[PDB]
Design a protein around this motif. Sequence first.
Motif, short mmCIF file in Angstrom:
data_model
loop_
_atom_site.label_atom_id
_atom_site.label_comp_id
_atom_site.label_asym_id
_atom_site.label_seq_id
_atom_site.Cartn_x
_atom_site.Cartn_y
_atom_site.Cartn_z
N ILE A 24 -5.83 -14.85 6.56
CA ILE A 24 -6.57 -14.00 6.86
C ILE A 24 -7.64 -14.49 6.14
O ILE A 24 -8.55 -14.76 5.22
N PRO A 25 -8.80 -14.11 7.03
CA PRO A 25 -10.47 -14.50 6.70
C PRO A 25 -10.82 -13.86 5.55
O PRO A 25 -10.39 -12.36 5.00
N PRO A 26 -11.64 -14.90 5.30
CA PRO A 26 -11.86 -14.23 3.83
C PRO A 26 -13.77 -13.19 3.98
O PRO A 26 -14.06 -13.07 4.47
N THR A 27 -13.18 -11.69 3.32
CA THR A 27 -13.71 -10.73 3.87
C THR A 27 -15.40 -10.62 2.03
O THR A 27 -16.30 -9.87 2.48
N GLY A 28 -15.09 -11.37 1.01
CA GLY A 28 -15.67 -11.02 -0.21
C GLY A 28 -14.89 -10.38 -0.76
O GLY A 28 -15.46 -10.23 -2.02
N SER A 29 -13.86 -9.64 -0.74
CA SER A 29 -13.28 -9.40 -1.73
C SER A 29 -12.05 -9.81 -2.82
O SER A 29 -11.34 -10.54 -2.90
N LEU A 30 -11.97 -9.92 -4.04
CA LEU A 30 -10.81 -10.41 -4.73
C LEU A 30 -10.58 -9.17 -5.27
O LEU A 30 -9.53 -9.27 -6.09
N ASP A 31 -9.87 -8.32 -4.39
CA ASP A 31 -8.66 -6.85 -4.87
C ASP A 31 -7.49 -7.65 -4.08
O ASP A 31 -7.54 -7.72 -2.70
N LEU A 32 -6.68 -7.84 -4.83
CA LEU A 32 -5.14 -8.68 -4.34
C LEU A 32 -4.18 -7.41 -3.87
O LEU A 32 -2.86 -7.92 -3.56
N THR A 33 -4.92 -6.11 -4.23
CA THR A 33 -3.52 -4.36 -4.10
C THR A 33 -4.33 -4.81 -2.12
O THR A 33 -3.64 -3.67 -1.97
N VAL A 34 -5.08 -4.74 -1.24
CA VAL A 34 -5.50 -4.83 -0.44
C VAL A 34 -5.62 -6.04 0.15
O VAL A 34 -6.35 -6.67 0.23
N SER A 35 -4.74 -6.22 1.80
CA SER A 35 -4.93 -7.19 2.74
C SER A 35 -5.58 -6.99 4.08
O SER A 35 -5.37 -6.13 4.61
N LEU B 32 -4.85 3.15 5.45
CA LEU B 32 -2.94 2.48 4.60
C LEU B 32 -2.07 2.26 5.81
O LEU B 32 -2.32 2.73 6.35
N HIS B 33 -1.44 0.84 5.51
CA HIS B 33 -0.45 0.57 6.78
C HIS B 33 1.16 1.38 6.18
O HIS B 33 1.51 1.99 5.28
N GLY B 34 1.31 1.45 7.51
CA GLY B 34 2.79 2.60 7.15
C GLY B 34 2.04 4.27 7.11
O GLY B 34 0.73 3.84 6.98
N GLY B 35 2.64 4.42 6.27
CA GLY B 35 2.73 6.04 5.59
C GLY B 35 1.19 6.14 4.32
O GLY B 35 0.15 6.69 5.24
N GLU C 182 0.77 -1.08 -0.23
CA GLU C 182 0.04 0.50 -0.10
C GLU C 182 1.09 1.13 -0.16
O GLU C 182 0.16 2.48 0.24
N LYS C 183 1.94 1.29 0.51
CA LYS C 183 2.83 2.54 0.35
C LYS C 183 4.52 2.40 -0.65
O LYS C 183 4.74 3.32 -1.82
N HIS C 184 4.76 1.21 0.08
CA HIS C 184 6.11 1.01 -1.46
C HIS C 184 6.41 1.28 -2.67
O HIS C 184 6.72 1.81 -2.96
N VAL C 185 5.22 -0.21 -2.70
CA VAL C 185 6.42 -0.29 -4.37
C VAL C 185 4.89 0.74 -5.48
O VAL C 185 5.14 1.02 -6.09
N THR C 186 3.60 1.17 -4.56
CA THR C 186 2.75 1.90 -4.87
C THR C 186 3.45 3.34 -5.02
O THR C 186 3.05 3.94 -6.70
N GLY C 187 4.24 3.44 -4.05
CA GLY C 187 4.69 5.24 -4.40
C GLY C 187 5.38 5.46 -5.08
O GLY C 187 5.47 6.22 -6.53
N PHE C 188 6.02 3.89 -5.99
CA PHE C 188 7.24 3.82 -7.58
C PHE C 188 6.29 3.74 -8.45
O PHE C 188 6.40 4.59 -10.20
N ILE C 189 5.18 3.42 -8.73
CA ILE C 189 4.55 2.55 -9.87
C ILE C 189 4.02 4.23 -9.57
O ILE C 189 3.82 4.57 -11.09
N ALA C 190 3.67 5.56 -9.11
CA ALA C 190 2.81 6.50 -9.48
C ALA C 190 3.84 7.30 -9.83
O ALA C 190 3.06 8.34 -11.35
N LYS C 191 4.89 7.01 -10.06
CA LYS C 191 5.74 8.37 -10.69
C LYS C 191 6.83 7.20 -11.25
O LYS C 191 8.42 7.58 -11.14
N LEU C 192 6.57 6.36 -11.80
CA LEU C 192 7.30 5.93 -12.66
C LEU C 192 8.04 7.38 -13.94
O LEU C 192 9.32 7.12 -14.27
#
Lengths: 172, 171, 104, 103
Positions: free
Chosen positions: B21-32, C101-104, A62-72
């Motif tokens: 991680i219990p299933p919440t109903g989401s299929l988004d792999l970017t939100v853990s 968001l976790h962290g920052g 949510e922070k580290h790789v996203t930040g790089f992706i946002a500013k290629l």
Amino acid sequence: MAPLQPGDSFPANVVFSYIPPTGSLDLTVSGRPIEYNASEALAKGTSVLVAVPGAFTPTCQEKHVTGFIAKLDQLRQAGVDRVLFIASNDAFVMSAWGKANGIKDESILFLSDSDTAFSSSIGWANAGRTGRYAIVVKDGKVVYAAVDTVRGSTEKSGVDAVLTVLGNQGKL
Amino acid sequence: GAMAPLQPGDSFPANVVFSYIPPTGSLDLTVSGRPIEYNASEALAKGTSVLVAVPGAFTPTCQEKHVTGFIAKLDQLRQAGVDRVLFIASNDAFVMSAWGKANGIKDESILFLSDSDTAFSSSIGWANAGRTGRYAIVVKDGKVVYAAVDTVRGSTEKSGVDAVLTVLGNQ
Amino acid sequence: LEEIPITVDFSGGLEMLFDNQRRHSISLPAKDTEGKPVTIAFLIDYISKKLMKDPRTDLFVLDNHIRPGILVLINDADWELEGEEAYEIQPNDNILFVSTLHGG
Amino acid sequence: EEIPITVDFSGGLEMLFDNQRRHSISLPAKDTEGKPVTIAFLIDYISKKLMKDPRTDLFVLDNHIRPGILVLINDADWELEGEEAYEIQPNDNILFVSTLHGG
Ligand SMILES: [Zn+2]
Ligand SMILES: [Zn+2]
Ligand SMILES: [Zn+2]
Ligand SMILES: [Zn+2]
Ligand SMILES: [Zn+2]
Ligand SMILES: [Zn+2]
Ligand SMILES: [Zn+2]
Ligand SMILES: [Zn+2]
Ligand SMILES: [Zn+2]
Ligand SMILES: [Zn+2]
Ligand SMILES: [Zn+2]
Ligand SMILES: [Zn+2]
Ligand SMILES: [Zn+2]
């Protein structure tokens, strides 16, 4: 082991395992891992190498790789020729992580520092995971090497830290 | 550690815990989500269970054959009386959660958990070099009824869905 | 020409933008640059320009609006219930910014 | 006349034949129909005259070869040289390998 510092030559014989991107975002179809010779690739041009404790984890995602992706675009404008993201995760997991982030090409490569062999040799690994650090290289020579030790921080290894240090150099 | 084969007619071992991680109903792999503990020993103590172990998440055989088979035949597993399906691996709970999502599993039909440091798998003799073996353990009210491992890489003959279904129909 | 005193809190990793200090005291101008009662929108703007100790402003404010993924609680009440960015700040209000968001 | 060949059994199949891999056998160059001998006849011949294990399930299932057995004709997969129809020719080697791979 010794801390890697700016002005040093990037170490030799550094290899990562990774699945070259095919253009697919399908997480269920695995390619075939091969070797990446980081020492050879970094020997010419400006490179950015980022390590993360764990693929698919919250801060790393949510922070580290996203930040790089946002500013290629900003990284490209700065002259960066390649961006590498490594972790202890195997080359299959790293490839799925890259796909999960919509990366279909070589803009960012997702590779595995198997058994934290490289990270351990520079003193930034623990308990089977790499640390959160970022290395910037220019024609073989290290220009920046910092690790974020504070839990959840991306101050030293995040995209913005890399952009600032790049602004103190000129090349492509 | 200590190792003892887990064989039919045994009580399923106590103190067996996984991280997931219990299933919440989401299929988004970017939100853990947030990993928690799963007390396998307590969950298996009542009803039919199917514990499947795989060497590695997001790998070819583990993906394209093993888990796809169980997903394809959940209706048939439900009709056979299976109350829960667990998939475990040495992968951490975040990677497991992303693997389950990548397979469209949004609910509890199949749970994706982590056998941390192959602690459980090593205790029954089916792990090596930081990965679990490819095995399947059917359990019924605390007692093991079937526990077989696939030794040859690529084979899902003993731990695959069709093996489990055959074992369930013989009671 | 009177002021309004408040306390603002930063959590969920947002504190790392303020040298890890969670709680801060601010006295705001009770009227903004157009003479209307001061609001959360003015506060968010103030924080990004005068309180942050980290140069990464996009971690708090993006395109002149609060970054998404930040809850805003007004005396423990979600600012969606009290009107977001238009809520007129009252004396001794406590405003909590917490990153989901976790962290920052 | 008869025709001479060598058949090999590996991947565990040998255990069905006194744990013997290689066998030399002379077939009739023609079948009951009188047509040239084919692999299908061979497979049927092995199951009825060479297996020492009574469970024929383990080699042939319902008149065809069990799945999971590779068949190589002079070191060539029989999918490239005709399946169960390759007309057997002298000094032809037929290799049967059982594999759990390929599932
Ligand atoms: Zn040094
Ligand atoms: Zn798919
Ligand atoms: Zn992994
Ligand atoms: Zn969390
Ligand atoms: Zn039931
Ligand atoms: Zn400080
Ligand atoms: Zn302050
Ligand atoms: Zn409170
Ligand atoms: Zn909202
Ligand atoms: Zn209210
Ligand atoms: Zn609104
Ligand atoms: Zn508070
Ligand atoms: Zn046939």
